[PDB]
Amino acid sequence: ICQNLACRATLSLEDGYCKRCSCCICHCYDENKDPSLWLVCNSDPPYLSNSCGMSCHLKCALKHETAGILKNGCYPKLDGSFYCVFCGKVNWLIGSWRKQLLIAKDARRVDVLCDRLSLSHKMLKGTEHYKDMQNIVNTAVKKLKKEVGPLDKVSAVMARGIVNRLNCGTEVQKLCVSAVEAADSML
Ligand SMILES: [Zn+2]
Ligand SMILES: [Zn+2]
Ligand SMILES: [Zn+2]
Fold it and tell me: I need a labelling partner for 1 at 20 to 30 A (CA). Which of 37, 70, 165, 179 fits?
């Protein structure tokens, strides 16, 4: 019996974690699950092959090389895609990348903006196929960094701030809109 209130799925002897609600990397579930912070192995276009349905935190996939996003000597790096860490199936990142930018451009809080933009920035780092898209994101990040420093290390004082009160806030959010449109136009 799963202890996650929003799941309560029956577990087995096999399980070191519940497959339905928990991340297959860190073996943790979220209290109020936000699907935009998760990746799921599925058979959606453009990758129709058989999938396992296993899920992980987007952040966990970015942090560990086995997912084929973080460049490593061991794993052939993918461009705009990830390896499901369970079954190995290649899945697309672009849907997730889009979602991060849509939340960023509408964000009122600085920490949301920094966090979401940083994820998009990492997801497509070193891309060849999506260069034009990501160059817009790179421009937005460089602008934001000049005001808050490294996006992942933003101070608590800046974090509680309002995006509109930043000197570059509206400019950065305009760039987020631009990046999403660029993705939509190419695809
Ligand atoms: Zn569960
Ligand atoms: Zn995780
Ligand atoms: Zn899978």
Answer: 37
Length of the chain: 187
Q: Which residues neighbour ligand 2 (ion) by CB within 5 Å?
A: 23, 25-26, 57, 60
Structure-derived torsion over alpha carbons of residues 128, 126, 159, 40, reported in degrees to the nearest 10: 70
Q: How was this structure determined?
A: X-ray
**Beta-bridge partner residues of 109:** 162
Taking the centre of ligand 1 as the mean of its atom positions, its distance from the CA of residue 23, in whole angstroms, is 10
Contacts of 119 (CB under 8 A, 6+ apart): 58, 59, 62, 100
Residue 136 parent element (H or E): helix 131-148
- The resolution, in angstroms to one decimal, equals 2.1
> How many A from CA of 73 to the centre of ligand 2?
23
Q: Are 10 and 2 in contact (CB under 8 A)?
A: yes
- CB within 8 A of 96, min separation 6: which ones? 36, 39, 58, 123
Ligand 2 center from residue 38 Cα (angstroms): 9
